[PDB]
Amino acid sequence: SDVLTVSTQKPLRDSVKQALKNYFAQLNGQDVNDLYELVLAEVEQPLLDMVMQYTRGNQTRAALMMGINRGTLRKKLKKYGMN
Amino acid sequence: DVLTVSTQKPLRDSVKQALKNYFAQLNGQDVNDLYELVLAEVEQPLLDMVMQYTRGNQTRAALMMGINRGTLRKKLKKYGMN
Amino acid sequence: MYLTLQEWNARQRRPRSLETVRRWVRESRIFPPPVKDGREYLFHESAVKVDL
DNA sequence: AATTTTGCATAAAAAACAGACTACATT
DNA sequence: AATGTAGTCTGTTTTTTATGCAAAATT
Numbered sequence: 001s002d003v004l005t006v007s008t009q010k011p012l013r014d015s016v017k018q019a020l021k022n023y024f025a026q027l028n029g030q031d032v033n034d035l036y037e038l039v040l041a042e043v044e045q046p047l048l049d050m051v052m053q054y055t056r057g058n059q060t061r062a063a064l065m066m067g068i069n070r071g072t073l074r075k076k077l078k079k080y081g082m083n
Numbered sequence: 084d085v086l087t088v089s090t091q092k093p094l095r096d097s098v099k100q101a102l103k104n105y106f107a108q109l110n111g112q113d114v115n116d117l118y119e120l121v122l123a124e125v126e127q128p129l130l131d132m133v134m135q136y137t138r139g140n141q142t143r144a145a146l147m148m149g150i151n152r153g154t155l156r157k158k159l160k161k162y163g164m165n
Numbered sequence: 166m167y168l169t170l171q172e173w174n175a176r177q178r179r180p181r182s183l184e185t186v187r188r189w190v191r192e193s194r195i196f197p198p199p200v201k202d203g204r205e206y207l208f209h210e211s212a213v214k215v216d217l
Numbered sequence: 218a219a220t221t222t223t224g225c226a227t228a229a230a231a232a233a234c235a236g237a238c239t240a241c242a243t244t
Numbered sequence: 245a246a247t248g249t250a251g252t253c254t255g256t257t258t259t260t261t262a263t264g265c266a267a268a269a270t271t
Binding site: 003004005006007009011012013014015016017018019020021022023024032033034035036037038039040042043045046047049050051054064065066067068 | 085086087088089091093094095096097098099100101102103104105106108114115116117118119120121122124125127128129131132133136146147148149150
């Protein structure tokens, strides 16, 4: 049924929900102002590492598989110190 | 380190395992929308959690998320969160 | 009626790199010649590659 | 009653986009 | 020879943003 799942198997969305549930528990009155970016960077980097590993360093195929502009991929790879 | 999931391994490790499993099931299938696919799986729980924390207050949810309120109501409308 | 350079190519018997398909437009190898509307090319759904 | 949130409109900055083109690689 | 890719650019469109404001809702 679900295409992105983790090892019994469960959806990746269920693991994100649990990761944030823990974060809000270990948030003893802290003001948070960058939660989107924090989650995005934690999910973008392993996606970039896995796709680049899959395409064997081929940027053009990674971008084509991801459905993002090649110039956009190159920027994200630079952001995470990967190129 | 800050975003982790119980045995406690980090979240990036759960994304890596989901994609390893995904590439394995690609039986001749031609991938074209992987960024959005991952993003939509990660965006729905984030929006669910942050709104649950702010008790449905979008003003506070946008501030916590570091995004603009307009951008938030757009993402909410996309995942049918109305 | 009209496709993007990417759509047109995806529909080809042997799709190529978008870099290759652009070189073709730049070299006048696509007939009828795609028009550039802003940032993109617009291929008529019937457009073919020609041997020069 | 007072204060905050929301829904929606702008305009501009920021991001993502298609393409151009060269040097070198792979087919 | 023709095609494919990294890297460096240009110009265009789309998304995000700050801001103003009135109605609605919460305090």
